PDB file of N, CA and C in Angstrom:
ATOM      1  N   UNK R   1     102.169 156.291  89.645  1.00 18.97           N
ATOM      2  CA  UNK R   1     103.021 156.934  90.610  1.00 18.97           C
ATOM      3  C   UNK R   1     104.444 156.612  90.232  1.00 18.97           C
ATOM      4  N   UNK R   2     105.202 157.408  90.689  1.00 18.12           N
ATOM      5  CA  UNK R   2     107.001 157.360  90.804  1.00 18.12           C
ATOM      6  C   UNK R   2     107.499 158.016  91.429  1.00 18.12           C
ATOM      7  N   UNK R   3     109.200 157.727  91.448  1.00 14.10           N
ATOM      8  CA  UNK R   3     109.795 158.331  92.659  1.00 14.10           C
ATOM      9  C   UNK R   3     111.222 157.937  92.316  1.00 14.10           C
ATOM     10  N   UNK R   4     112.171 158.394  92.606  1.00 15.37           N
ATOM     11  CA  UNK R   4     113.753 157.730  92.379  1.00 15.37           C
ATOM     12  C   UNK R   4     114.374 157.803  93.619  1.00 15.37           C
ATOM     13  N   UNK R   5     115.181 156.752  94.248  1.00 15.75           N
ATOM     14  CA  UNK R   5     115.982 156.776  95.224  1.00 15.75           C
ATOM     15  C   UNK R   5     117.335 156.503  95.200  1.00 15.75           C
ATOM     16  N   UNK R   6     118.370 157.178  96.081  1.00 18.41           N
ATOM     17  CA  UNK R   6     119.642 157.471  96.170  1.00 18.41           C
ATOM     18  C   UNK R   6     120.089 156.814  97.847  1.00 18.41           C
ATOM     19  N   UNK R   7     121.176 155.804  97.439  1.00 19.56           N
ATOM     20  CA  UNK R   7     121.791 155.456  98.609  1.00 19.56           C
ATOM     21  C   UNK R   7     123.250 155.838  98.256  1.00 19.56           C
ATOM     22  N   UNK R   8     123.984 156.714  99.721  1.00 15.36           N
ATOM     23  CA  UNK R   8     125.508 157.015  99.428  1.00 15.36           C
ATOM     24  C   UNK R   8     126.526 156.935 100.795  1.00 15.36           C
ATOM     25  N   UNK R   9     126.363 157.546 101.541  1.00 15.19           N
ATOM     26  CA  UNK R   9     127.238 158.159 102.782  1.00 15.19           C
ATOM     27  C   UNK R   9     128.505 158.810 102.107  1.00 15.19           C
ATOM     28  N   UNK R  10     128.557 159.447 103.170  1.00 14.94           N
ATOM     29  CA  UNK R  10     130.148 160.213 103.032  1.00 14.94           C
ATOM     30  C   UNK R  10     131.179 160.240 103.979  1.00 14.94           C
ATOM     31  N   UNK R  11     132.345 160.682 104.215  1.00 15.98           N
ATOM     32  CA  UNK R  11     133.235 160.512 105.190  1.00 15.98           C
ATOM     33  C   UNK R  11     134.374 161.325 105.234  1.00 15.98           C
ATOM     34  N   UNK R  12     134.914 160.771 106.242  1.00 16.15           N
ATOM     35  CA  UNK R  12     136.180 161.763 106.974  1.00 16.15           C
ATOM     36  C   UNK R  12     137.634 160.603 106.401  1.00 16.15           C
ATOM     37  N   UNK R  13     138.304 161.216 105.540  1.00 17.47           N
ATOM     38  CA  UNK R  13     139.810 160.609 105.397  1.00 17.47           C
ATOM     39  C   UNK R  13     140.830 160.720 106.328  1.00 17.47           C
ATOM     40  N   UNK R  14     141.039 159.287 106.695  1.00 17.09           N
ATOM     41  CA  UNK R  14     142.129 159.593 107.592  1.00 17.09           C
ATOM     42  C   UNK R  14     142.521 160.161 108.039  1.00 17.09           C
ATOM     43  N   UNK R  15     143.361 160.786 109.158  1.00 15.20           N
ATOM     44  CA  UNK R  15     144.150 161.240 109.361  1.00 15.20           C
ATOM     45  C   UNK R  15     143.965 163.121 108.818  1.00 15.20           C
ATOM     46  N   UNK R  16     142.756 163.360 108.680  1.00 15.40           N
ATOM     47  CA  UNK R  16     141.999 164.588 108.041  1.00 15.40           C
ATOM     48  C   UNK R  16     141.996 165.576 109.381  1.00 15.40           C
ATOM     49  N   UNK R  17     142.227 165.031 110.314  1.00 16.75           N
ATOM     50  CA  UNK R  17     142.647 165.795 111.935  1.00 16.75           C
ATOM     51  C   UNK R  17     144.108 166.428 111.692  1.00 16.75           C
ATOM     52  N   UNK R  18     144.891 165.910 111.696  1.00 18.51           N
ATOM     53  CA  UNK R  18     146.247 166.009 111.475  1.00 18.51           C
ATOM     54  C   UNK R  18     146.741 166.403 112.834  1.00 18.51           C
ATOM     55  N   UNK R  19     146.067 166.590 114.009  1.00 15.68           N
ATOM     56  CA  UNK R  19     146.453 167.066 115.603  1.00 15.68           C
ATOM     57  C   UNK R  19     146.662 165.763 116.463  1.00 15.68           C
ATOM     58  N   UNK R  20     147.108 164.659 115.389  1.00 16.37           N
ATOM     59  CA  UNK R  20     147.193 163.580 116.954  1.00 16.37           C
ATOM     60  C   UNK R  20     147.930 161.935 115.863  1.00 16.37           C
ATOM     61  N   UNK R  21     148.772 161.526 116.782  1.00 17.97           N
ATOM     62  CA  UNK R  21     149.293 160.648 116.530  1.00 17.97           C
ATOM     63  C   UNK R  21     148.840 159.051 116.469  1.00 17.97           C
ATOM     64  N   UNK R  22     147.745 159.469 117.219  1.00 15.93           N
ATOM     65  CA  UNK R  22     146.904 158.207 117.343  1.00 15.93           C
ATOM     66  C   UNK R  22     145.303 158.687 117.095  1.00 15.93           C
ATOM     67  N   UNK R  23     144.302 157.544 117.076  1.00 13.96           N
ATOM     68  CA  UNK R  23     143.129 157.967 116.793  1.00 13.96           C
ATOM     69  C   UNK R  23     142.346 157.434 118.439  1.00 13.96           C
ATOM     70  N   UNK R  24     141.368 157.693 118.584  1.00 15.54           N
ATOM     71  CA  UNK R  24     140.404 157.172 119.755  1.00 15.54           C
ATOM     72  C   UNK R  24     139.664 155.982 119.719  1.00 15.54           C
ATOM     73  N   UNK R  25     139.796 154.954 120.407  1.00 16.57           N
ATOM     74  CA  UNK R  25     139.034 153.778 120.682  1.00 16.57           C
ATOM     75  C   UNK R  25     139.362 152.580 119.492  1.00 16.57           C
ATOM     76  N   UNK R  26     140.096 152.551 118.384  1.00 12.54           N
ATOM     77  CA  UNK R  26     140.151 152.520 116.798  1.00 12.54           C
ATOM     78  C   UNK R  26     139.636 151.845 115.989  1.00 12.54           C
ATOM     79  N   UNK R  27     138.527 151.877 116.441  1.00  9.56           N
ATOM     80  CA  UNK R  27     137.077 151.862 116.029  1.00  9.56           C
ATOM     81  C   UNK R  27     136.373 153.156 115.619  1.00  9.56           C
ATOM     82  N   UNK R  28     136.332 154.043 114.552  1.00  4.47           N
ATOM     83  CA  UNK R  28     135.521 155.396 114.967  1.00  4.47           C
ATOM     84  C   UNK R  28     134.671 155.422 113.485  1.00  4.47           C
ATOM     85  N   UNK R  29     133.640 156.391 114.018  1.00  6.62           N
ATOM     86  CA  UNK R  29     132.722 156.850 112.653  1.00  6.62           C
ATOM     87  C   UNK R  29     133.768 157.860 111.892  1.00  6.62           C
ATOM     88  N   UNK R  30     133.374 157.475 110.689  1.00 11.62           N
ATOM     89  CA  UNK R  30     133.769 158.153 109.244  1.00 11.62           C
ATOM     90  C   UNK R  30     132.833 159.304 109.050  1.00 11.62           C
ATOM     91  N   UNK R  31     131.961 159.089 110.006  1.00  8.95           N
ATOM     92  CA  UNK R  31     130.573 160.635 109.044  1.00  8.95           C
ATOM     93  C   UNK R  31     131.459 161.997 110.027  1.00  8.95           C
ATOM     94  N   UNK R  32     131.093 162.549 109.282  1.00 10.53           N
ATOM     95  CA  UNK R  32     131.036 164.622 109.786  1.00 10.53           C
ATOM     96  C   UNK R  32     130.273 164.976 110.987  1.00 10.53           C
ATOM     97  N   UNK R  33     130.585 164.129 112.001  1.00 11.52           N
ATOM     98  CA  UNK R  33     129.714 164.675 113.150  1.00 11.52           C
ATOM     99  C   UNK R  33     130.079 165.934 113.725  1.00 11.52           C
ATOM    100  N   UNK R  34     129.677 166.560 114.982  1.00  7.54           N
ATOM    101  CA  UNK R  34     130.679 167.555 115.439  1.00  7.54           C
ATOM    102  C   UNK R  34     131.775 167.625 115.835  1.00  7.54           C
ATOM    103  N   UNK R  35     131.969 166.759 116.880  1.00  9.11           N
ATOM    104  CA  UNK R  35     133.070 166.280 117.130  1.00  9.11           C
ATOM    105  C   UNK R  35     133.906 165.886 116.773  1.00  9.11           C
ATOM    106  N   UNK R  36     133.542 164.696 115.233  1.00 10.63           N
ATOM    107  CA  UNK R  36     134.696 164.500 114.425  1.00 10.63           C
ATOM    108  C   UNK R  36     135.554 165.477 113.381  1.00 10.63           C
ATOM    109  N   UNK R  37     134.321 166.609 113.238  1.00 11.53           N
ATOM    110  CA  UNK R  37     135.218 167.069 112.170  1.00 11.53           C
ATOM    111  C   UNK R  37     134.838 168.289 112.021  1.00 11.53           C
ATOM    112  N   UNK R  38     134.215 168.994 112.760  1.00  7.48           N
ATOM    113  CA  UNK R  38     133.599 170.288 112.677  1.00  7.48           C
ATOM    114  C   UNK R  38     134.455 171.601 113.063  1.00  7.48           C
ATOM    115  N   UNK R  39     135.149 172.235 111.810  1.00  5.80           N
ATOM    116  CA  UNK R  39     136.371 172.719 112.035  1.00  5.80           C
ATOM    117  C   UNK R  39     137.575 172.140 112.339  1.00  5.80           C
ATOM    118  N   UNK R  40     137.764 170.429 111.445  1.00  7.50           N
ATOM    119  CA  UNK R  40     139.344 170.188 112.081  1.00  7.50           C
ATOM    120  C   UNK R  40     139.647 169.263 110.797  1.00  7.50           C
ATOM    121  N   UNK R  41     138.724 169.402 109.400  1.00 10.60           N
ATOM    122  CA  UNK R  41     139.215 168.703 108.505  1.00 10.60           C
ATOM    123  C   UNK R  41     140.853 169.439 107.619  1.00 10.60           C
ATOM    124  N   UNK R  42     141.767 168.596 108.103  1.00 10.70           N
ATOM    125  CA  UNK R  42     143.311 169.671 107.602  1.00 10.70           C
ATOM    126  C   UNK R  42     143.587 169.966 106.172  1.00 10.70           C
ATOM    127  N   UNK R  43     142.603 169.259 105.195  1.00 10.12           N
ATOM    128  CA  UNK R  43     142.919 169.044 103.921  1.00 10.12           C
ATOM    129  C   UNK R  43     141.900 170.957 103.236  1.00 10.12           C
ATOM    130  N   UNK R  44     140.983 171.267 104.574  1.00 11.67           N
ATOM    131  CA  UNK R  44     140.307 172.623 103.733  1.00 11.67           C
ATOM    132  C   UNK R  44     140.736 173.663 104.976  1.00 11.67           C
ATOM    133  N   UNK R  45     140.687 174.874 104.650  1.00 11.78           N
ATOM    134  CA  UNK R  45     140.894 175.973 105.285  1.00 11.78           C
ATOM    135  C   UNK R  45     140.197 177.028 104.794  1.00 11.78           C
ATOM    136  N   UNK R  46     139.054 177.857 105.961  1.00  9.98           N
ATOM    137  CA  UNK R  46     137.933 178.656 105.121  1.00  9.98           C
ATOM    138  C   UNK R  46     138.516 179.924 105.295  1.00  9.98           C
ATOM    139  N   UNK R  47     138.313 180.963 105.349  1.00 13.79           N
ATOM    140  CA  UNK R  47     138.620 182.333 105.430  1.00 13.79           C
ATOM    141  C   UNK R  47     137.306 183.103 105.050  1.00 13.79           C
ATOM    142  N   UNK R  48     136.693 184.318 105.943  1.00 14.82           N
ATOM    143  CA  UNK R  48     135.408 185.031 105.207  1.00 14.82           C
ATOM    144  C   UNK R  48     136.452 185.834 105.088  1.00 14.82           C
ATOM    145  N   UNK R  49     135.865 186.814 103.700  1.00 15.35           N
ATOM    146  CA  UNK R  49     136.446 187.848 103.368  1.00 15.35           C
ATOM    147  C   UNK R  49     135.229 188.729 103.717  1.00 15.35           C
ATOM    148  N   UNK R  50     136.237 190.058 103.640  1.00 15.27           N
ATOM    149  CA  UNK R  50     135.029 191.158 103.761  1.00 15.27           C
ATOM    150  C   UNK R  50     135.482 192.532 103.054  1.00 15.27           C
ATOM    151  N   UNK R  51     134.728 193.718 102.856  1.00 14.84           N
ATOM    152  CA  UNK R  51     135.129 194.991 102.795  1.00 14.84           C
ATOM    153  C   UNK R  51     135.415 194.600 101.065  1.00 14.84           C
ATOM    154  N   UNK R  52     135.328 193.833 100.524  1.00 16.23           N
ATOM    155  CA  UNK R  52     135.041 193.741  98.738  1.00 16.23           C
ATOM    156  C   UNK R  52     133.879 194.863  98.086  1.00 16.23           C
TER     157      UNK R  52
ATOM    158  N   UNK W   1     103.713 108.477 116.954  1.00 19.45           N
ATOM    159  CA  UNK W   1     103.251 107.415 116.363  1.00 19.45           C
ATOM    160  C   UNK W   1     103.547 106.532 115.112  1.00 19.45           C
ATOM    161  N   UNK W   2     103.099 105.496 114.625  1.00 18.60           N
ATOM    162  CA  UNK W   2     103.211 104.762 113.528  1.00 18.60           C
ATOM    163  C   UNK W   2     102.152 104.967 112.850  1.00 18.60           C
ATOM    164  N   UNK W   3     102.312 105.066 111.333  1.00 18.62           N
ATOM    165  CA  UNK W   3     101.181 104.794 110.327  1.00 18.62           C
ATOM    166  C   UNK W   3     101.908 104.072 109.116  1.00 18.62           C
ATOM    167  N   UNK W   4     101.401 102.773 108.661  1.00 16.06           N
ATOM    168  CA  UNK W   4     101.431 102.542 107.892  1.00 16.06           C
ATOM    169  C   UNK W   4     100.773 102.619 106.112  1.00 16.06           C
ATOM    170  N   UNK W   5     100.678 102.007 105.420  1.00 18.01           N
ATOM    171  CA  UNK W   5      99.865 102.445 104.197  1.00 18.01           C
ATOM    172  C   UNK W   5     100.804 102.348 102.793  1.00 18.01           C
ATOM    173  N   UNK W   6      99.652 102.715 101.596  1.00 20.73           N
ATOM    174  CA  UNK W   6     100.183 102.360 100.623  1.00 20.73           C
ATOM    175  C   UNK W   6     100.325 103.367  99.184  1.00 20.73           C
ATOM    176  N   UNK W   7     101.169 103.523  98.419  1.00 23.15           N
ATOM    177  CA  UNK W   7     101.451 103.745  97.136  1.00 23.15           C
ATOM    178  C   UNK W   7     101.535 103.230  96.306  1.00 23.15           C
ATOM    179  N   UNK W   8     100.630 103.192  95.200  1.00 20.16           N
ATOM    180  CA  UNK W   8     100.698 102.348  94.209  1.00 20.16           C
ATOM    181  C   UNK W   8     100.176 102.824  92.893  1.00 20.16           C
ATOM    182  N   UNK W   9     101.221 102.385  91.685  1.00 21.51           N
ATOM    183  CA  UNK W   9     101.102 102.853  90.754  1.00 21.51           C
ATOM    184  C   UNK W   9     101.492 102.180  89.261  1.00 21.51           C
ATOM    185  N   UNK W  10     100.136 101.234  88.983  1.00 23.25           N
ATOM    186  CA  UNK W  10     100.319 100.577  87.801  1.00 23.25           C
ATOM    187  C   UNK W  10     100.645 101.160  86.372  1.00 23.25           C
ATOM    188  N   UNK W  11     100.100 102.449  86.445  1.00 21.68           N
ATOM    189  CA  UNK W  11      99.955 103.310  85.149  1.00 21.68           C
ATOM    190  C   UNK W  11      98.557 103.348  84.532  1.00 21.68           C
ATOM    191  N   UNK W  12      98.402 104.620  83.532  1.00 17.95           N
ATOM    192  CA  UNK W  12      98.057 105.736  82.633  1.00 17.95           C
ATOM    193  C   UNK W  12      96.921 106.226  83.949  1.00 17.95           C
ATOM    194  N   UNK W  13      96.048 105.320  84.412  1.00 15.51           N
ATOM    195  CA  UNK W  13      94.758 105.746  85.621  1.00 15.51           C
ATOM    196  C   UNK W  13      95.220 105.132  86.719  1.00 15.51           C
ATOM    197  N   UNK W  14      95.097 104.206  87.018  1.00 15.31           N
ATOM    198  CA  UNK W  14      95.748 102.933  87.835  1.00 15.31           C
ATOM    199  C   UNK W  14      96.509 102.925  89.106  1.00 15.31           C
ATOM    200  N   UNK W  15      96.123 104.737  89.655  1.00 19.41           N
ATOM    201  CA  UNK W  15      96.811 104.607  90.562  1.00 19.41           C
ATOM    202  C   UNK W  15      95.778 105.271  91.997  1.00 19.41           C
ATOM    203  N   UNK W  16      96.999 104.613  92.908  1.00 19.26           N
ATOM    204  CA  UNK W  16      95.742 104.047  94.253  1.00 19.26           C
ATOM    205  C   UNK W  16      97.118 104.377  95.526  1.00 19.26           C
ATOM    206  N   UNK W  17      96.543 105.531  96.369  1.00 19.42           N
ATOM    207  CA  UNK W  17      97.130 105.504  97.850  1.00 19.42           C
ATOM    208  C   UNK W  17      95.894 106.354  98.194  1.00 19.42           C
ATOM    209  N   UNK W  18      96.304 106.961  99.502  1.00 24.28           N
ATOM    210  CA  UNK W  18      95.573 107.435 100.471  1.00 24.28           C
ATOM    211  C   UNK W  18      96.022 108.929 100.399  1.00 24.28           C
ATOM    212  N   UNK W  19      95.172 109.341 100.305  1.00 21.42           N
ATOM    213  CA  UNK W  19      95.108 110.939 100.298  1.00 21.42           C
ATOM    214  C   UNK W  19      96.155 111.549  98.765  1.00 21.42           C
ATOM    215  N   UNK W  20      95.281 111.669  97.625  1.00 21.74           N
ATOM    216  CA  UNK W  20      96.455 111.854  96.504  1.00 21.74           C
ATOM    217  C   UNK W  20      97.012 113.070  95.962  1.00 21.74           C
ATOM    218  N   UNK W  21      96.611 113.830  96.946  1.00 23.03           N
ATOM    219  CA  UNK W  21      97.091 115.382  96.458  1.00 23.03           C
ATOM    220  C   UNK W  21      96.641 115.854  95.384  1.00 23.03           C
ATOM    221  N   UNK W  22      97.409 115.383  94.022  1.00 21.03           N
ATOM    222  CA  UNK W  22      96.219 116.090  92.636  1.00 21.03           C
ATOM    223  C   UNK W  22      96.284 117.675  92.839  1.00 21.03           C
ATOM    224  N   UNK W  23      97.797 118.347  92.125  1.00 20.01           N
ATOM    225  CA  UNK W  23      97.997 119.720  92.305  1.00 20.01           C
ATOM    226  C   UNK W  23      96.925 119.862  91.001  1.00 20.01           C
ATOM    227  N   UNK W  24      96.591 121.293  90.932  1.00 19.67           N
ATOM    228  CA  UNK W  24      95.700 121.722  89.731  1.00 19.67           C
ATOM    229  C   UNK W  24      96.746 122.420  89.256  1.00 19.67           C
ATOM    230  N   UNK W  25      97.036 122.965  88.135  1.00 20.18           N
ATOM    231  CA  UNK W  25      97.880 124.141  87.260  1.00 20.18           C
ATOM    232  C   UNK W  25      97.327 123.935  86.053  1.00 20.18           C
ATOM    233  N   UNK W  26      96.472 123.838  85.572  1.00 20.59           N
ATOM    234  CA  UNK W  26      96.115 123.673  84.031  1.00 20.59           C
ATOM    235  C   UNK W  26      95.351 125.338  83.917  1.00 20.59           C
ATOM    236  N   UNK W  27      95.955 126.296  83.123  1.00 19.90           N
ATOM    237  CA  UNK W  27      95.337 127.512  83.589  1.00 19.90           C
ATOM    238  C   UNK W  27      96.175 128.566  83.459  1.00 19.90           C
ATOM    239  N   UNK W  28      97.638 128.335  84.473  1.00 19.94           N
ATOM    240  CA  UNK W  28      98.572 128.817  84.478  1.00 19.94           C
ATOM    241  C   UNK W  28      99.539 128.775  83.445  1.00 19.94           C
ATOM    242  N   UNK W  29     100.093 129.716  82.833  1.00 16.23           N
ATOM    243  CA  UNK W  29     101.732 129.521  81.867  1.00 16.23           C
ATOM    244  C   UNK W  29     102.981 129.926  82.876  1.00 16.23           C
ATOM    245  N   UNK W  30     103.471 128.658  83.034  1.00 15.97           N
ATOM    246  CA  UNK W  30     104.102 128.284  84.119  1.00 15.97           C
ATOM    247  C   UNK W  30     105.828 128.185  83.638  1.00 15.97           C
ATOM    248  N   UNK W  31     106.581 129.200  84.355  1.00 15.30           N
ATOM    249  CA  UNK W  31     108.190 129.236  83.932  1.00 15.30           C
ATOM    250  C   UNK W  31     108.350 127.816  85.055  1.00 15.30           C
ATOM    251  N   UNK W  32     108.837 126.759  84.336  1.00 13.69           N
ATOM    252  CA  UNK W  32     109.133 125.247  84.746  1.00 13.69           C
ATOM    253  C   UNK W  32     107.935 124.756  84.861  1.00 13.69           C
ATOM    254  N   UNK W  33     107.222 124.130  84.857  1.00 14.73           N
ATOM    255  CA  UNK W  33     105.971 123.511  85.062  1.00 14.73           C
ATOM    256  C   UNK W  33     105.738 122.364  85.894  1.00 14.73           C
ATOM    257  N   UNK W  34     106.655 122.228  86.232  1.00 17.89           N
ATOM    258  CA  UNK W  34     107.015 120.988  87.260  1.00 17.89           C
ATOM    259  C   UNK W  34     107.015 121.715  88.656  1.00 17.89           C
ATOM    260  N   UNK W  35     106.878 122.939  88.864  1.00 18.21           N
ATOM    261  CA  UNK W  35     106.844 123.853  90.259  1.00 18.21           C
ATOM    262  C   UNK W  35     105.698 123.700  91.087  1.00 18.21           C
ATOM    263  N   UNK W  36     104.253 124.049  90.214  1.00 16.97           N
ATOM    264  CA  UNK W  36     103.362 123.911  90.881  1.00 16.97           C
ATOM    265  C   UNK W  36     102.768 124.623  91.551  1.00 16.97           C
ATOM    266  N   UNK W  37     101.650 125.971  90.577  1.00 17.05           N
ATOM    267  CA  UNK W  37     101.830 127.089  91.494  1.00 17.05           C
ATOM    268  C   UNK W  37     102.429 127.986  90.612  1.00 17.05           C
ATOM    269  N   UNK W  38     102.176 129.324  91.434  1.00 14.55           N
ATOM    270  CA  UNK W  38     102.671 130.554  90.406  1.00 14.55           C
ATOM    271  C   UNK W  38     103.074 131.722  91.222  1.00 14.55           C
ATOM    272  N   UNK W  39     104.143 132.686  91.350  1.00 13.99           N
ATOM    273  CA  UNK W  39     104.309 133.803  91.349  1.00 13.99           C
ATOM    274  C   UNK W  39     103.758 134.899  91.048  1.00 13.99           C
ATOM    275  N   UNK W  40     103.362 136.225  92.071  1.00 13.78           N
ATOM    276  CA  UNK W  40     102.869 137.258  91.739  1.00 13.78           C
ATOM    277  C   UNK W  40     103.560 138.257  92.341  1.00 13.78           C
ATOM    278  N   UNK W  41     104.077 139.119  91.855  1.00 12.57           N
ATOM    279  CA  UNK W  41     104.721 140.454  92.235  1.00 12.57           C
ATOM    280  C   UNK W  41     103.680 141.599  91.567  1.00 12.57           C
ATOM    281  N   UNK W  42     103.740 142.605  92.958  1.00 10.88           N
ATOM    282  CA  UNK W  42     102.337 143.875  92.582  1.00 10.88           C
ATOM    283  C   UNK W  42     103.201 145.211  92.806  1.00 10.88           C
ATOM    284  N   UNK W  43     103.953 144.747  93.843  1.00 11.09           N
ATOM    285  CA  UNK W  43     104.885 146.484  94.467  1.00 11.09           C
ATOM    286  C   UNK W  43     103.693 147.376  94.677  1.00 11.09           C
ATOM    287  N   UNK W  44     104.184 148.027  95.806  1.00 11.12           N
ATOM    288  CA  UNK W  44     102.897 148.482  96.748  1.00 11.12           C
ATOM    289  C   UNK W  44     103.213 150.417  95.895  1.00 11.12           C
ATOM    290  N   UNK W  45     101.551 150.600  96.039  1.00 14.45           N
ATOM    291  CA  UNK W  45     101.045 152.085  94.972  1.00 14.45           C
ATOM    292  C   UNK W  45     101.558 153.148  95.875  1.00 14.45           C
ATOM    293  N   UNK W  46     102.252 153.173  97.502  1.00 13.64           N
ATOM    294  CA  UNK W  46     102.516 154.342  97.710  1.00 13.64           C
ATOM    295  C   UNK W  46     104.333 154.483  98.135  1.00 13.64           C
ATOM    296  N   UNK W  47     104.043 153.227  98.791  1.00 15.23           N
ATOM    297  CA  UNK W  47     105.260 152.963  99.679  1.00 15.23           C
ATOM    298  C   UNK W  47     105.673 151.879  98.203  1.00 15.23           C
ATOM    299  N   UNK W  48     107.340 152.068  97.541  1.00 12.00           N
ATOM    300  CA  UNK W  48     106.927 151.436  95.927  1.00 12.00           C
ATOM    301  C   UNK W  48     107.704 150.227  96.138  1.00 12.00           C
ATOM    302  N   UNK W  49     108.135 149.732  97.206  1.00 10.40           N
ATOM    303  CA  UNK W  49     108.943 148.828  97.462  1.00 10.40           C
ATOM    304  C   UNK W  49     107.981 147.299  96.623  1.00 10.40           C
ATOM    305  N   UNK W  50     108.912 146.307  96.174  1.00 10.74           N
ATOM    306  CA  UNK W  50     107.839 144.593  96.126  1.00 10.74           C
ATOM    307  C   UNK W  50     107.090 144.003  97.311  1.00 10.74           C
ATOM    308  N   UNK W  51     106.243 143.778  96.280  1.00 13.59           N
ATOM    309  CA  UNK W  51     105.205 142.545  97.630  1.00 13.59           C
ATOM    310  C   UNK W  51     105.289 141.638  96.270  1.00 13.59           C
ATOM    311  N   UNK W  52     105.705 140.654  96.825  1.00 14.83           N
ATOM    312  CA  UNK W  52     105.750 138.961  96.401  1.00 14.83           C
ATOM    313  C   UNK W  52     105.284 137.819  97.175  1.00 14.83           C
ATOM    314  N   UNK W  53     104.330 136.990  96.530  1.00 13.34           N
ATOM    315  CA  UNK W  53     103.738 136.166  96.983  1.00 13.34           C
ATOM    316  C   UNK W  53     103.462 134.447  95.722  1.00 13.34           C
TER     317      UNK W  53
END
C-alpha cells in the first residue's frame, strides 16, 4: 500500500480589507472564511465579461 | 515499610542477592547493548501512520 500527504494552510494579508483602520478583537483568523474575506480581498478585483 | 537485604558480588559466578533479575538478550543485534531489549516499528497497513513498541 501507499499514499502521500500534504500539510499547508493559507491566508488573508493584512490589511487585504483596506475598509477599516483598525482590525476586530486583534486576535483574528487568517483563513478565507466568509466573513473575512469573501468579496473584500483589496489586492484582486474580478469583473465577468460577457457578449465576447 | 522497611526491608532490608543483600548484594553481593565477589566475581566471574560469585554472585548472591535476592531476586537477580538476569535480563536475557543473547539473540538480539542490539544498537548499544547495554539497553536491554529491542525496538520494533511495523506502521499500520491501512491507516500508514508508526506503531512503535
Amino acid at each position: 500500500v501507499m499514499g502521500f500527504k500534504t500539510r499547508y494552510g493559507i491566508g488573508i494579508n493584512p490589511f487585504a480589507e483596506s475598509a477599516a483602520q483598525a482590525p476586530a478583537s486583534r486576535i483574528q483568523s487568517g483563513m478565507p472564511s466568509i466573513l473575512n474575506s469573501l468579496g473584500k480581498n483589496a489586492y484582486f478585483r474580478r469583473v465577468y465579461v460577457k457578449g465576447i | 515499610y522497611v526491608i532490608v537485604g543483600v548484594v553481593e558480588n565477589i566475581g566471574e559466578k560469585e554472585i548472591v542477592g535476592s531476586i537477580f533479575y538476569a535480563p536475557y538478550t543473547e539473540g538480539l543485534d542490539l544498537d548499544d547493548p547495554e539497553h536491554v531489549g529491542a525496538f520494533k516499528v511495523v506502521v499500520d497497513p491501512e491507516s500508514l501512520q508508526p506503531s512503535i513498541g
